């Protein structure tokens, strides 16, 4: 009558987690840490299938964060260390954003010392005593400084995460997807689109734009501590620079280990600053405000500057040609032809929020200028029922993973079970 | 069609073009990674595990007597207690996902039966 029949190739999938690799179309990503390849990609559109998605527990972002940290560490380790720099620095006025400091170091011969001098930003300097003229670097008691490695480039490049054999990626193509819920238009792929691992705070930069209109997403809107990601459809133009003409000196601190520092500054004292197109910014603030009014009832929405705190979390942060800019955005998010914001810069950068590791970025010789697109915002709701009329939002940083969720929220990883059994009229074998 | 193109199609349609899904299981990345990387070891782990899974599935197919058959036909009667639904209903108004979910409890035992059946057949093939 009815007999069993086994089928190989049955299209059924489970939810699963795996080690996804990456691919790219000197630089750490391009020539290390995953393969260079980009053949004709295979994208297909499934029919009559609905798939559930929730971006707020997805192992893609954890894997990407771990890979980014590991790659940066592996890049930093195989070159110069800065243990002899942690000495007493005699600092004086430049003769206002820097200080001229002289200090004693070793040389090519261990029985001889040398006197050298360099310019240092005061954000990289800590005093030793109130009634004294002694100074040291920030991370000389809490970590060990490693110099950013001059021949390698810390420039983001597009990267594609790719699934191994026996796995697949499902992509939600539904317009205006907020990351949680069913998906009625699903596609299958093997490799994600171009993802640029850019690290920034308070302003998402160089990202893919929303398809139709602004998308607002958070893990829990009712909670206030959680970050709110805003994904715009119109990119904003932000171009900015350190214009001061610098010159870097090479200091021999040992047998072949050279330490580069700000040898001198020439020209007029000009401050590093960021320009943003003002009219586009006003338009995008209006669009974000009236879009976010939907999720928050009839209560009015106000924007205010970031609360006081550490420079890393309070100020917007980014990197340009290796120079680390901390910009005070106290006028961008101040609401209810060009807008200019101040930008300090820092050399001893202690990112990844770990301890015992810190990096020193040598200054580029000439001035630095670079242009980019603001493609998203990270906003934080202020807690407390101070008023029942207006709800005020602030710039917000927090976990670095939020910088990548906006690019990885369409994707799901699924395992394939190819073996099935079914009854059929076939008997003979 | 393409890989997993027939997910929404009923089982009768999915019986065609199983070869795309079968062939996708072994396609890989010809390039590899340079030395002294945990990334390289993770990649090696992943692909060795993939090979092991494929080999396990193929061996399980072979023990049942379907060494090189995608749609083979065994000789085990289908107990109605497993899933008692009409042939037309099963092959015309149901996807493979719903089917695999609805007979999840009785899968394991079914496998054992297949084993025994083939073994019996093999023994008879030497006693006849």
């Amino acid at each position: 009558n009815l007999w069993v029949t086994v089928y190989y190739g049955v299209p059924v999938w489970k939810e699963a987690t795996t080690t996804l690799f990456c691919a790219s179309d000197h630089n750490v990503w391009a020539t290390h840490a995953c393969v260079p390849t980009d053949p004709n990609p295979q994208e297909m559109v499934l029919e009559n299938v609905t798939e559930n998605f929730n971006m707020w527990k997805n192992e893609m972002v954890n894997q990407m964060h771990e890979d980014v940290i590991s790659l940066w560490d592996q890049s930093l380790k195989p070159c110069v260390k800065l243990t002899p720099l942690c000495v007493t620095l005699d600092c004086t006025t430049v003769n206002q954003e820097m200080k001229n400091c002289s200090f004693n170091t070793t040389t090519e011969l261990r029985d001889k010392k040398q006197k050298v001098y360099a310019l240092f930003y005061k954000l990289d300097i800590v005093p030793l005593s109130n009634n004294s003229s002694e100074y040291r670097l920030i991370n000389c008691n809490t970590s060990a400084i490693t110099q950013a490695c001059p021949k390698v480039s810390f420039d983001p490049i597009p990267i594609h995460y790719c699934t191994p054999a026996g796995y697949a990626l499902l992509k939600c193509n539904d317009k205006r997807f907020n990351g949680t819920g069913p998906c009625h238009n699903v596609s299958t792929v093997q490799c994600t689109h171009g993802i640029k691992p850019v690290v920034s705070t308070q302003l998402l930069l160089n990202g893919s734009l929303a398809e139709k209109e602004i998308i607002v997403r958070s893990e829990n809107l009712t909670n206030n501590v959680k970050t709110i990601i805003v994904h715009l459809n119109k990119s904003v133009e932000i171009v900015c620079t350190r214009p001061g003409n610098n010159t870097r000196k090479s200091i021999r601190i040992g047998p072949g280990q050279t330490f580069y520092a700000t040898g001198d500054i020439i020209g007029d004292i000009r401050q590093a600053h960021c320009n943003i197109s003002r009219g586009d910014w006003e338009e995008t603030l209006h669009n974000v405000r009236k879009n976010l009014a939907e999720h928050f009832q009839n209560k009015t929405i106000q924007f205010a500057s970031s609360s006081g705190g550490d420079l890393e979390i309070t100020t917007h942060s980014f990197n340009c040609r290796g120079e680390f800019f901390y910009c005070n955005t106290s006028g961008l998010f101040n609401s209810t032809l060009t807008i200019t914001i101040p930008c300090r810069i820092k050399q001893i950068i202690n990112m990844w929020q770990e301890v015992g590791r810190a990096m020193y970025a040598p200054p580029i010789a000439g001035n630095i200028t670079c242009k980019s697109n603001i493609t998203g915002l990270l906003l934080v709701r202020d807690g407390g029922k101070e008023s029942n009329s207006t709800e005020i939002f602030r710039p917000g940083g927090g976990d670095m993973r939020d910088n990548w969720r906006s690019e990885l929220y369409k994707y799901k990883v699924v395992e394939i079970k190819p073996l099935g059994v079914a009854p059929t009229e076939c008997k003979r074998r | 069609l393409g890989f997993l193109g027939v997910a929404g199609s009923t089982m009768g349609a999915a019986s065609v073009a199983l070869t795309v899904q079968a062939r996708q299981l072994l396609s890989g990345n010809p390039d590899w990674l340079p030395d002294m990387t945990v990334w390289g070891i993770k990649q090696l782990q992943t692909r060795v595990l993939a090979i092991e899974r494929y080999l396990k599935d193929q061996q399980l197919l072979g023990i049942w007597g379907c060494s090189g058959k995608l749609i083979c036909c065994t000789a085990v009667p289908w107990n109605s207690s497993w899933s008692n639904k009409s042939q037309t209903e099963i092959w015309n108004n149901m996807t493979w996902m719903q089917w695999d979910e609805e007979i999840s409890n009785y899968t394991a035992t079914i496998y054992r039966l297949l084993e025994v059946s083939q073994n019996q057949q093999e023994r008879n093939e030497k006693d006849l």
Partner: antibody
Amino acid sequence: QIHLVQSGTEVKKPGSSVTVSCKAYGVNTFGLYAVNWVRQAPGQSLEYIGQIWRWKSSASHHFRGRVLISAVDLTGSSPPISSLEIKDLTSDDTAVYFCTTTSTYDKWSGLHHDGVMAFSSWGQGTLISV
Amino acid sequence: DIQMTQSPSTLSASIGDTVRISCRASQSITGNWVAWYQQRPGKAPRLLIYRGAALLGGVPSRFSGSAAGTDFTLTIGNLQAEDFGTFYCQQYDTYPGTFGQGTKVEV
């Protein structure tokens, strides 16, 4: 972690409409989480009033055209909300109504089928008399 | 529609005893697809078992379920300390679902 807060007891003269509210504390959204309304009268027979699932609302045959089930997603000042509305009430509708929420993300867990499902979380129920 | 009938209607019990409640369906249920619930007087129902014989978390390990072709049996073994109230058998094979009449346990 998951709680369901329901409206208060309210008794009405027969011949009017009634609304009942269910408030899901801890539910991220009504995607991945289906809401099912059930009834329990004296006689201790649990019935099935209706559901909202995948933003589609449906009711059983005994109540088609009689009950409207609505839902609003997570907002800033209010967790997800669901609501029963009975247009007309006879003498036999006196009962305690229960709101239930069930996770629908796994797609392989045994707690749900494509349309009919068990009830993982139960509210405290609203008593209605006529 | 799919009906069910539970048995026994009511049973006495005692601390440390093992009890069994069997619900039979009007149609053989291919998958397990049956659930067991508790309900104390004046409280809300609590899901005990789903998928025929799957045990949730927090519920004690003493409960167990057996799924035959048509008859489903809930085994509450080693009734410890506090006794229980009303037990319920529910099917979710076809739409709409249906609950059983119910059984009561007493000391």
